[PDB]
Write a protein that binds this ligand. Structure first.
Ligand SMILES: O=C(Nc1nccs1)[C@H](CC1CCCCC1)n1cnc2ccc(F)cc2c1=O
Ligand SMILES: OC[C@H]1O[C@H](O)[C@H](O)[C@@H](O)[C@@H]1O
Length: 427
C-alpha cells in the first residue's frame, strides 16, 4: 500500500473506535438490556428485550403436521412438514411453483389468490384437505404476507387453514442455524436494519413467570442510543443522517450500523473531503450532493475492488464524477472507515449479549447464527466483525454460521417453531 495522504487520514480517523470505546458501548448496551428484561423498567426501556415465547423446551406438542411456505423472488415452495422424535426429525414433501406474469404484475390480492390456488392443488395432491393445517412463512430472497394469505384463503372458502404469525427475522436466523448446529443460541441480522436475539435464562426474563430453562429474547437493540448512550461517538455525518431521517433521535444504534444509512454516511464523508479540497479537486457532482445517491450497495462494490480501481471508477462515473486514481483510493478508504465502524459498533452489541450469556450461565462455547445483506455481501465486514467480537469476549469460543438453504429443513424448523408457538399461545 502507498503512504496515504495525511489530511485524508485525519478526517477518516474520526471513525476509529478503540477497545476502551467499544467496552464502554458494550457496558451501556448491557445496562439497557438489563432495563428491558426487568418488570419494573421494561415499559420505559428503549431496548425492549421482547420475550419471543420460543423456549428451550419443546412446546405445542399437538402440532405435528404443518405447511411451510417459502417465498423466493419469483417463485415459492409449498412444503408439508411432519416433525417427530431427543432431537426432532423433520419429514417433508414439497413443490416449487412459478408465479406467472399475470399473478406477479397485478394486485397483491390476485397474487395471493394464485398462491392459495397452488396450496389447494398441493393439498389435493397429498390428500390433506381433511385437516386444518397451520402454515408458517419463510423467506429466501436473493399489507403483509400473513394477512394477504389469510384473506385469500377466506376468499376461496373451500379449505380451512391457519396462517401463523411469523417470528422475528433474528429468531428465524437462530432457529434455522440451530437446525444445522445445536449450539446456536444467538441470532443476528446485519442488513438494512440490525438486531439480535438470544436464549436468555428464564429467571432473567421477568416478563414471563418461571425460572426453568431458557427463552429467546428479541432485543430490538436498534433503539439503543435514545438517552444519549452513543452521543460521545456520534460524528457530524451521523447527526446529519439522523436529522434528515424519518425518526430523528430514534434508532441511533441502528443508524450507525444498518445498510439503510451506510451509503448516506459515506456520501457525507465524501462531501466533507470535497469541501476540504481533498477529493475530486473540490468539485462534487449534483448526484453526489443528492441525498441517497450513494447507495449502500456502492459501499460494498467499492470495497470489492480488486486493486485496478475499475469497480470504483464505474460507481463514481455513474455519479457524474471523473475520479483520478487517488480519488478512487480515497473513496475506498472512506467506505472502509464507515463499514469498519459499523462492524465495531455491531460487535459491541453482540459482545454485550455473549458476555451476559456467559455470566448468566457461569469458558463458554456458543454458536451465533447471522444473516443480512451487510454481513453477507459486504467484503470483509464479517471478518472485521468476527475479529472485534472475539476481542471483546475473552473466555468465549464463538462459532459464526450462516443458514444453508440445504433441502429447506432449517426453514421448515422455523415454521415448526412458529406453528408450535401459535398453538401454545392459543392463537
Ligand atoms: O421449538 C422450540 N421451542 C418452542 N417454544 C415454543 C414453541 S416451540 C425450541 C426452539 C429452539 C430454538 C433454538 C435455540 C434452542 C431452542 N426447539 C426447536 N427445535 C428443536 C429441535 C430438536 C430438539 F431436540 C429440540 C428443539 C427445541 O427445543
Ligand atoms: O431486519 C433486522 C431488524 O430490523 C429492525 O431493527 C427491526 O426493528 C427488527 O425487528 C429486525 O430484526
Amino acid at each position: 500500500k502507498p503512504m496515504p495522504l495525511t489530511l485524508v487520514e485525519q478526517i477518516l480517523a474520526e471513525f476509529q473506535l478503540q477497545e476502551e470505546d467499544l467496552k464502554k458501548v458494550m457496558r451501556r448496551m448491557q445496562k439497557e438490556m438489563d432495563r428491558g428484561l426487568r418488570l419494573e423498567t421494561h415499559e420505559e426501556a428503549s431496548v425492549k428485550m421482547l420475550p419471543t415465547y420460543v423456549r428451550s423446551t419443546p412446546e405445542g406438542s399437538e402440532v405435528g403436521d404443518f405447511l411451510s411456505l417459502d417465498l423466493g423472488g419469483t417463485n415459492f415452495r409449498v412444503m408439508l412438514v411432519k416433525v417427530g422424535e431427543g432431537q426432532w426429525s423433520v419429514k417433508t414433501k414439497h413443490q416449487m411453483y412459478s408465479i406467472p406474469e399475470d399473478a406477479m404484475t397485478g394486485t397483491a390480492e390476485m397474487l395471493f389468490d394464485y398462491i392459495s390456488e397452488c396450496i389447494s392443488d398441493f393439498l389435493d395432491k397429498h390428500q390433506m384437505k381433511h385437516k386444518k393445517l397451520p402454515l408458517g412463512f419463510t423467506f429466501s430472497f436473493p399489507n403483509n404476507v400473513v394477512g394477504l394469505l389469510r384473506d385469500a384463503i377466506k376468499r376461496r372458502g373451500d379449505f380451512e387453514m391457519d396462517v401463523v404469525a411469523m417470528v422475528n427475522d433474528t429468531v428465524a436466523t437462530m432457529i434455522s442455524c440451530y437446525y444445522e448446529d445445536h449450539q446456536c443460541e444467538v441470532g443476528m441480522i446485519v442488513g438494512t436494519g440490525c438486531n439480535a436475539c438470544y436464549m436468555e435464562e428464564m429467571q432473567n426474563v421477568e416478563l414471563v413467570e418461571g425460572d426453568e430453562g431458557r427463552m429467546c429474547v428479541n432485543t430490538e437493540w436498534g433503539a439503543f442510543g435514545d438517552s444519549g448512550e452513543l452521543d460521545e461517538f456520534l460524528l457530524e455525518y451521523d447527526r446529519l443522517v439522523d436529522e434528515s431521517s424519518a425518526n430523528p433521535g430514534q434508532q441511533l444504534y441502528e443508524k450507525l450500523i444498518g445498510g439503510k444509512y451506510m451509503g448516506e454516511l459515506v456520501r457525507l464523508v465524501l462531501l466533507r473531503l470535497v469541501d476540504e479540497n481533498l477529493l475530486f479537486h473540490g468539485e462534487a457532482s449534483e448526484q453526489l450532493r443528492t441525498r441517497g445517491a450513494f447507495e449502500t450497495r456502492f459501499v460494498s462494490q467499492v470495497e470489492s475492488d480488486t486493486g485496478d480501481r475499475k469497480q470504483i471508477y464505474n460507481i463514481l462515473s455513474t455519479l457524474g464524477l471523473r475520479p483520478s486514481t487517488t480519488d478512487c483510493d480515497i473513496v475506498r478508504r472512506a467506505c472502509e472507515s464507515v463499514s469498519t465502524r459499523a462492524a465495531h459498533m455491531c460487535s459491541a452489541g453482540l459482545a454485550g449479549v455473549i458476555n451476559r450469556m456467559r455470566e448468566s450461565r457461569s469458558v463458554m462455547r456458543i454458536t451465533v447464527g447471522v444473516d443480512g445483506s451487510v454481513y453477507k455481501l459486504h467484503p470483509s465486514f464479517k471478518e472485521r466483525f468476527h475479529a472485534s467480537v472475539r476481542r471483546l469476549t475473552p473466555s468465549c469460543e464463538i462459532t459464526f454460521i450462516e443458514s444453508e438453504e440445504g433441502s429447506g429443513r432449517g426453514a421448515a424448523l422455523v415454521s415448526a417453531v412458529a406453528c408450535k408457538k401459535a398453538c401454545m399461545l392459543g392463537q
